[PDB]
Structures are given as structure tokens and as C-alpha cells.
Paper text:
A peptide from ENAH interactor ABI1 was among the highest affinity ligands that we validated by BLI, with KD = 2.6 μM. ABI1 contains an FP4 motif followed by four prolines. We solved a crystal structure of the ENAH EVH1-ABI1 peptide complex at 1.88 Å resolution. Only the FP8 region was fully resolved in the structure under the crystallization conditions, which included high salt and low pH. The peptide folds into a PPII helix with prolines 1, 4, and 7 (0FPPPPPPPP8) contacting the EVH1 surface. The FP4 portion of the peptide binds the canonical FP4 groove, as observed in other structures, whereas the 7th proline docks into a previously uncharacterized site on ENAH composed of Ala12, Gly92, Phe32, and the aliphatic part of the side chain of Asn90. We note that residue 12 has diverged in EVL and VASP EVH1 domains, which may contribute the weaker binding of ABI1 to those paralogs, although we have not isolated the affinity difference to this specific change. Notably, a similar binding site at the analogous location is used by the Homer EVH1 domain to bind the phenylalanine of PPXXF motifs. However, this site is relatively shallow in ENAH, and modeling large aromatic acids at this position on the ABI1 peptide using Pymol leads to severe steric clashes. Homer contains a smaller Gly89 at the site of Asn90 in ENAH and can accommodate the bulky Phe of the PPXXF motif.
Ena/VASP proteins form a family of cytoskeletal remodeling factors that are recruited to different regions of the cell by binding proline-rich SLiMs via their N-terminal EVH1 domains and promoting actin polymerization via their C-terminal EVH2 domains. The Ena/VASP EVH1 domain recognizes the SLiM [FWYL]PXΦP, where X is any amino acid and Φ is any hydrophobic residue. This motif, referred to in this paper as the FP4 motif, because FPPPP is a common example, adopts a polyproline type II (PPII) helix structure and binds weakly to the EVH1 domain. Focusing on the EVH1 domain of human ENAH, an actin regulator that is highly expressed in invasive cancers, we screened 36-residue proteome-derived peptides and discovered new interaction partners of ENAH and diverse mechanisms by which context influences binding.
Author numbering: 2 to 113, 120 to 129
Amino acid sequence: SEQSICQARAAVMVYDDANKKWVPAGGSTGFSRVHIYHHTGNNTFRVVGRKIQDHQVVINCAIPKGLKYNQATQTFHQWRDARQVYGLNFGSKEDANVFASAMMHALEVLGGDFPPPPPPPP
């Protein structure tokens, strides 16, 4: 039981600490459709990305409470969920902003009040 909260086009990268370089996740360079998914029950989240060409899954990691998500530039973001470092090299600023905005919201919901909001603008 999952819901996509955003969809963003990006080249998905991992850092190769041995060779001191970023390498394309899954071994093949190219853009991916990168989602953040919310498990409606657990109230957990995860980033999932698939290559656009061959639909290979290149990232599939859960978003832990307390993740340090870094926007190096407006269009390259990075974090280290596990032992490796992940990067997202976005196709456009529009893509970068939606993904960052969804990630921030995910991290709030994981982090844990306010009066109800006003009506949406007419």
C-alpha cells in the first residue's frame, strides 16, 4: 500500500570512495524517473528510481528519520542512507525543487502543532 508523492527526472549517482568519483547507479549512465513513496500504513517513506530506457531499478532505499539531505547545487542533491553516498543530478530545476520539496515534507512527517490552514486562494 504505497503512494507516490513526487516524480522527478534525474541521473542517479553513487560515490565510489575507492576511485574518488561519482559513478552512475546500476552501472549505466542515463536518466531515471525517481519517486518518493509513502507507505500509508507504516508512515514510512522511500526513494525509488528506474532507468527510463530499460526500467532497471537503480535506487530503492528507505528514508530514515533524521536523514541529512544536502543540496550541493540547486540541481545536484546528495545524502548517505547506507554505507554508500547517493546523488541526484536533476534534468531541470523544476525536477530538483519538486523532489526536494517532497523530501522535506517526508522528513517532517518522520520528524513528528499548528492551527488548521486557510482556504486555498481563489
